[PDB]
Amino acid sequence: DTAAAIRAELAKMEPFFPSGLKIVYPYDTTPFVKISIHEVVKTLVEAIIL
Amino acid sequence: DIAQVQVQNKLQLAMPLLPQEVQQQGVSVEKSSSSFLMVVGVINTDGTMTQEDISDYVAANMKDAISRTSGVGDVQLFGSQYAMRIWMNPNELNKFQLTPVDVITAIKAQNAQVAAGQLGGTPPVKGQQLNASIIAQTRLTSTEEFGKIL
Amino acid sequence: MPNFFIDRPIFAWVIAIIIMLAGGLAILKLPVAQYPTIAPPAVTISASYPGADAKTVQDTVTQVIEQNMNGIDNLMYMSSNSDSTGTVQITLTFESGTDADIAQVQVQNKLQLAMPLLPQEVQQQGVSVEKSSSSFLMVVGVINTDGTMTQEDISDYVAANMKDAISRTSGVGDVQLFGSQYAMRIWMNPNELNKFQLTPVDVITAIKAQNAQVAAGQLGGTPPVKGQQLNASIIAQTRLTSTEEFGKILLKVNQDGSRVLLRDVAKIELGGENYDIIAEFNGQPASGLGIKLATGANALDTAAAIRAELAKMEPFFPSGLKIVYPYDTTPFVKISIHEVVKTLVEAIILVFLVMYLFLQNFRATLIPTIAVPVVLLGTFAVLAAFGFSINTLTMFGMVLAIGLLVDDAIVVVENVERVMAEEGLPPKEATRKSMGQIQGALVGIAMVLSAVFVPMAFFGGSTGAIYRQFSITIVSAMALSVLVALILTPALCATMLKPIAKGDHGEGKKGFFGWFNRMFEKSTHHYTDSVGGILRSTGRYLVLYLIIVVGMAYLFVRLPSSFLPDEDQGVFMTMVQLPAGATQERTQKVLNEVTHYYLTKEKNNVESVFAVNGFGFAGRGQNTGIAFVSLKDWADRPGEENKVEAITMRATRAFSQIKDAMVFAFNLPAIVELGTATGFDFELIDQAGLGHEKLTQARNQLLAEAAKHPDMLTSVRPNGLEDTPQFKIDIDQEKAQALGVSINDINTTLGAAWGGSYVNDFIDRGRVKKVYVMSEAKYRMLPDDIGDWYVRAADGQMVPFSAFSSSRWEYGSPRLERYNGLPSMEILGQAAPGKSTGEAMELMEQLASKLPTGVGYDWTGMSYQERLSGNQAPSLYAISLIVVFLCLAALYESWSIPFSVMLVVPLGVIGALLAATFRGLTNDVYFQVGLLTTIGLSAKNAILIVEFAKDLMDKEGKGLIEATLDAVRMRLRPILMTSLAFILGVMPLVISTGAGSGAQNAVGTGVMGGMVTATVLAIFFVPVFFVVVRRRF
Amino acid sequence: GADAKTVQDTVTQVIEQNMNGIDNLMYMSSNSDSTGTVQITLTFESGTDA
Amino acid sequence: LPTGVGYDWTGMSYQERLSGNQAPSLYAISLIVVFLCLAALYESWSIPFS
Amino acid sequence: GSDLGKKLLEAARAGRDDEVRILMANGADVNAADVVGWTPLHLAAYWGHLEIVEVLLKNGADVNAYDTLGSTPLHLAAHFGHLEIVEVLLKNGADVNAKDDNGITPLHLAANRGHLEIVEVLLKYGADVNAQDKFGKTAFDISINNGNEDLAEILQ
Secondary structure (H helix, E strand, O other): HHHHHHHHHHHHOOOOOOOOOEEEEEEHHHHHHHHOOOHHHHHHHHHOOO | HHHHHHHHHHHHOOHHHOOOHHHHHHOOOOOOOOOOEEEEEEEEEOOOOHHHHHHHHHHHHHHHHHHHOOOOOOOOOOOOOOOOOOOOHHHHHHOOOOOHHHHHHHHHHHHHOOOOOOOOOOOOOOOOOEEEEEEEOOOOOOOOOOOOOO | OOOOOOOHHHHHHHHHHHHHHHHHHOOOOOOOOOHHHHOOOOEEEEEEOOOOOOHHHHHHHHHHHHHOOOEEEEEEEEEEEOOOOEEEEEEEEOOOOOOOOHHHHHHHHHHOOHHOOOOOOOOOOOOEEEEEEOOOOOEEEEOOOOOOOOOOHHHHHHHHHHOOOOOOOOOOOOOEEEEEEEEEEEEHHHHHHHHOOOOOOOOHHOOOOOOOOOOOEEEEEOOOOOOOOOEEEEEOOOOOOOOOHHOOOOOOOOOOOOEEEOOOEEEEEEEEEOOEEEEOOOEEEEEEEEEOOOOOHHHHHHHHHHHHHHHHHOOOOOOEEEEEEOOEEEEHHHHHHHHHHHHHHHHHHHHHEEEHHOOOOHHHHHHHHHHHHHHHHHHHHHHHHHHOOOOOHHHHHOOOHHHHHHHHHHHHHHHHHHHHHHHHOHHHHHHHHHHHHHHHHHHHHHHHHHHHHHHHHHHOOOOHHHHHHHHHHHHHHHHHHHHHHHHHHHHHHOOOOOOOOOOOOOOOOOHHHHHOOOOOHHHHHHHHHHHHHHHHHHOOOOOOOOOOHHHHHOOOOOOOOOOOOOOOEEEEEEEEEEOOOOOOHHHHHHHHHHHHHHOOHHHHHHHHEEEEOOOOOOOOOOOEEEEEEEEEOOOOOOOOOOHHHHHHHHHHHHHOOOOOOEEEEEEEEOOOOOOOOOEEEEEEEEEEOHHHHHHHHHHHHHHHHOOOOOOEEOOOOOOOOOEEEEEEEEEOOOOOOOOOOHHHHHHHHHHHHOOEEEEEEEEEEOOOEEEEEEEEEHOOOOOHHHOOOOOOOOOOOEEEHHHHHEEEEEEEEEEEEEEEOOEEEEEEOOOOOOOOHHHHHHHHHHHHOOOOOOOOEEEHHHHHHHHHOOHHHHHHHHHHHHHHHHHHHHHOOOOHHHHHHHHHOOOHHHHHHHHHHHOOOOHHHHHHHHHHHHHHHHHHHHHHHHHHHHHHHHOOOHHHHHHHHHHHHHHHHHHHHHHHHHHHHHHHHOOOOOOOHHHHHHHHHHHHHEEEEHHHHHHHHHHHHHHHHHOOO | OOOHHHHHHHHHHOOOOOOOOOOOEEEEEEEEEEOEEEEEEEEEEOOOOO | OOOOOOOOOOOOHHHHHHHHHHHHHHHHHOOOOOOHHHHHHHOHHHHHOO | OOOOOHHHHHHHHHHHHHHHHHHHOOOOOOOOOOOOOOOHHHHHHHHOOOOOOHHHHOOOOOOOOOOOOOOHHHHHHHOOHHHHHHHHHHHOOOOOOOOOOOOHHHHHHHHHHOOOHHHHHHHOOOOOOOOOOOOOOOHHHHHHHHOOOOHHHHHH
């Protein structure tokens, strides 16, 4: 949730950036914790299918 | 929260013991985990933007608005803001019989905002039709204004 | 459960006694306030860097704190306002559900570590973090009739003597002061300082040196010598108590031995700290203090105890002093909470005698008169458990529930009385047979209504705190009503009722009663034949349903949405705003005209006038002013021409003539701390380091381009202030050292002479007061007197300001506001009378996309809660409809049936939408709550029709049509009892003007309208829906 | 260095001036010694979070 | 004592009179809650009186 | 000081041509003055409104008017860089070598900010370059303190 608030606020600045500045995300641990839960969600879905 | 409160209530007894060189830099008390939640990088795609220029913009226009966020206990900047760094030279200071103490005195005597007062203030006299503020000095706000310091 | 509380009646009683006593421990403890804490918690940093401008504060005080408010939890705003008087005010705003104490300490501390960045001239004055409620429980004014006193003496006699006294009082919270406690001020005459070759610097020195406290030590202090028989503290020179003593301090000595003092150079007096504010109670020089409530206390008793504490000290203070109450709301809160008590006790009376009209049996009428008080008292107990309080919202919550309280009693009583009449069965068997029909329908209704009101509690944020009071109250009320209808009411029916044998349908003998029974039977037979005739014809009366739904949806859009009605709290306000560069004398000439108008032309209504010069809203400047107008009791103000909604217009019209003064009179909003008039709080932010001037250009542009669409934007105002003249002195740094003049001498002279410097503290009558130094007005009003101030060089020769300085004028801003760190300026406005707000928002966030490079927009205030909200109500009501459909399919055991019941929600809605249109009533929250109540009890009066018909077609197999006929016949009577009792108990709310008018009417009109329609339409449609659905499935 | 009266005037009567209006407060005592040391003891009701 | 001189308790002496003023309502709320429980258990107003 | 001049002062600072021309139709005073001593000429020259400053002097506005300290509208226009207003108020008879009570010409205000085009505009029309304030400061010394090279060579 904190990371979502931050990824929102950053979008709330890019329009006012001068010519050339760019935002990169070289390090984020959240991309893993919303994939670690998806591959188990679809796992227990395949489970009821099987 | 109450833990940070107790910790910060015990500083108040210690802060008057520290030098005016620490307080003036800003002490910081903060809950925190030891690992970075994340990192956010800023780059000028084209050019004409040195590390210094990107770090300034980051500190000024997107650091404070993120440290105020709810969930962010600590934020570390990979650089620093701007600052009118004044790189001095002794061979030109002993030539004028000067020293850094006089430099600092002149600066902090000429980069200062004075509590001037008020035109047509309070309590006024019967028959006053004017109210204005007074202004004597300002923060030099540039680089070509620090050089004219006498 | 019911068949349990028939052979065990006393058991039921001991519950109804407990949940009665449990209410008494809550009628006496529950805190009584006007409105609960709905606003978002907030705190206000405040700091007065004295004798300053708006940029000095922005750059030395505001930006510093604005950078170090890091790591605060649940933060939404960082609003900030720096003025020209010196006072910065920073207003944060946390979410809903936040502890105010924890947030307040987080701020206190994040500032305590920011303090050693501010100057040595704010740390002294200090800052003050305090919660923002803006809610004066009541204000107290103190006058001297004789005229021997001033504001600066009444203020002191209040602070040193009374502020303490009413602070030990029960539930008093924080006490604010108008005026300023005594302080010794030294007014200097630079024509005399040059003669003695002095300045306002060695004066600062001699006053800091000849008043300070010094530590000395002890005698015989440890470690001692063997043989000491004495220990006693040592006391050196200490503070100066009396002003005369200040005239005895030395500054210098001349060659001839002549000794210089203060008396011969300066003028010493006891006055106030800041003279900017000037209060007047009907022109009488006056002052006062303001009290706001402690969280979790009773306002009525608090005010009755303060009105006593102020008399306990009536005789002690001097003769000529009077105490008046300019602004109080308790005289209105007492009414607002009583006008409902006499409504609830009027409703139990009406439902008692209505059952004397239909049942014609004393023992049958007493039963609800016993159940309804039980339910109300249990509701009070439940509120007391959850920490809730007694408010206007919570009481109106049970007012518009009382119908659901009486409905769950008469449905139990009239059915047992119908059974005892149709079969002659005794009361015990008759009840145990009736509850064999209803015990499940009442639980289904409990679940339905729980699903209907509960979702209202999870809504937006500030409206959440209102809908939540309403929902908690009404849900508690119905949960207890259904229980006492399954616990107590049937036991009462088994004992208090009296046996009647079969054939006692009721014919009546002589009076109203025989006529009424006869006409009831006749109307029943005719209505029954009518419903049969309708059931023969579907389509007709199935297409009228679509006509009604279309009319409802088309009325739901010509209804101007609102939040709360403004009412007559007995007080309103006037605001004066003069041109820039305006003085105090002109503002007081305008406020005295205001006072003369209100005390000469409107003395039949107006009690008093409390004028304050310098205390304006959206500005503390010398330019503006405010006036709190108080009105006589509501019995002394009869009619409609003598209300505030009319005095406001009269006064606005009359003061429109006041030349060179923007005057505006307006009534108080219901929720003071909140925004009013359905406006929007837009604001421009500069995210490219643009100047104040370029952003001002952008704002003027946006305004000039927003008057282009007057169709949805009406009055788009800049809440801020336009730039105003200001005096720029330029200190020549060359010619200042060419003569040997220290610049910290120049700046100090200037600031002390024109702004005032907090020098030290002194003691008076056992209290600490301040020592201010300043010039005498005569010598500091205009330029060209600057040359009168001579500062001292090291060579002794004194130099004027004319040798160092050059002078000029410039238009610099008198107020600089911020938002979330970045500079900004606020822009207000409101949507056109017919257009909604969202349209005005999207329009001017489409007009803001066309502003120069680097200028962005943001919403604040009430408009921020609508960005993160709006899509809550539809989803929550959709899931509520799903819950209702499932709870009814469970009760009837069918997936189709429920729709019949679910097709009477638009009937009770069109009645309210027609009444609120014929009366000009907006779509308040009271209106939505009345819509929901009508929906709930209409669905209740329909659920039982369907349950009766279904049971007749399963247990007795009578058939579809015949069973529906029998059901509409059985249930006709109670439906009219409920509708009639509710209508009669609510009619006073539609008529009652005066106190609680805009709220009583807003509730009762919608309620009555929905009831008429859901009564005379639902008797006819729900059987049609039942038969239709049974045929189609 | 301050005697018992100077501190009841400067230090104590200005703190107990604000300590009124605190929630669930049974009583409050205060002591003002001659060494300048000052103590103020607020006693709240039982069941109160300290 | 002279006029303008009041008295007040504190410490355990405060709780002492607090309990002394509490006990009389306690002995009643604990009786009128036994009467009700008994009348409920046995469904009679005479059994609890006896 | 009349109700027709105050509206001119209000509309010239806010930049309104319709209201200003209307109020001038009704015979309003274009020599109006605030409590500081400012005609709408000063406000226009200060805030950058042309198409208005071109209008006030046609209606008979005093060009060399001075406030309670001696600041003409050239002083205000020459201090911010309104070239299209400087080349106007001079064509209409403004004293380029003027002086406030202090003693500064509009050169001493244009050489401070670096409005070199205005420096040329002014010294084209006889601006004194050997003039001094009450401090003994020319425009050359002021251009040297600020360390400019353009304004250093313009003045030889």
